[PDB]
């Protein structure tokens, strides 16, 4: 029984910082695949940041240079570091270990991030 | 004593990338000739020399490599990058004195049912060093329960099959990938070309 | 990055009828693609992965086709409950992938 359980959704205002949370529970987080999914609340879910089992991250070209992908295998938990957020940044994400090519696909319930004026 | 580089590059089945083979090049007049003469490359990206000079200088040991991967991987054979092929089944240093020639080789893999005779390994608790090699089948322990061997839930084959066939994009054909790589010490010089 | 387009956007079919989806690529990709299924209020499930494999507990009523650009979700007969949003993501360059737009079917 794989699940997800994101945390430090909310409101923010435009250029602020915001820590999101993911406890896992079912696997470790340091030996997978993890994926910072986000959906709009208007179309379907796109990728944001991937971090691989060694180490290396990959972001996504909107969100370059600034969302910082963290991992504490101690607690097994994944942190997502929110910087300079813009009002288009307003959506839900998931967390997910992907592992689509091997069909096992787990998606968190995911957390509402609004930022407005 | 001619160079054997017709011998690497028209060579058939070349190895799969979680499996390179080396073939250290030694006591050879070797002319880089016949590899710029050799099928129009995707990629021949030069790192540390200058490819237009390369049959005027001499080192004391060249080695080739030779892989398949697919199209868009072949970005990651270059120093200081990260993925999934440079990362896992071959890592180039970062003071690299080499190139990373590439065809585009699609009618000889990708059979039309699928090629499944190519692996890359996906699946590694760190990431490689440099000029390392790692044939291992054992099952990668992705979960916290002990594996033991079978093949369960969290619990996978870190080698996966490319898949080739005649008809996917241009970035996910089968692409043959040899990269030549110098080393100059103190050993007194051994190969180089007929310009000296 | 390949772009994908799903028609039509608002099928409608009645329960224990076939329902016919269908999806399409920008450009050719190594025929890796998924089929999801996402209930509103829910995170997307795995229905199906490689364009023609089922995953784990997903009945045998979902079944995916094509290969190339065109690819082609069927249901053999919908029952009060398939009615959510269904994705086609293409994972071509794992583990970056692309989604849809939706293919919500309505009762």
Redesign the interface.
Known sequence: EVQLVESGGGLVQPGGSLRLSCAVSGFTVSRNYMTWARQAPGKGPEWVSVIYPGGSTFYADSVKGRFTISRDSSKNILYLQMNSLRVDDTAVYYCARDLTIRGEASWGQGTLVTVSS | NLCPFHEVFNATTFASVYAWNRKRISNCVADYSVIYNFAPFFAFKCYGVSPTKLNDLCFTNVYADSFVI?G?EVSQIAPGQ???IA??NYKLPDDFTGCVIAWNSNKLDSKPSGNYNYLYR??????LKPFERDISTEI?????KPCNGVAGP?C?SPL?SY???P???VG?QPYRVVVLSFELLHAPATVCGPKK | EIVMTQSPATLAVSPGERATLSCRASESFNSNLAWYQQKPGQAPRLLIYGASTRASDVPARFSGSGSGTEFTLTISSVQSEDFAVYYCQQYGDWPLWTFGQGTKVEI
């Not at chain 2, 990668?140 to 916290?144: F, I, K, P, R, V």
Request: proline share 0%.
């Open positions: 697919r868009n990260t993925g999934n990362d896992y996906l699946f590694r608790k760190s990431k990668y322990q992705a979960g916290n969290n996978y996966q898949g080739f066939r008809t996917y994009g996910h």
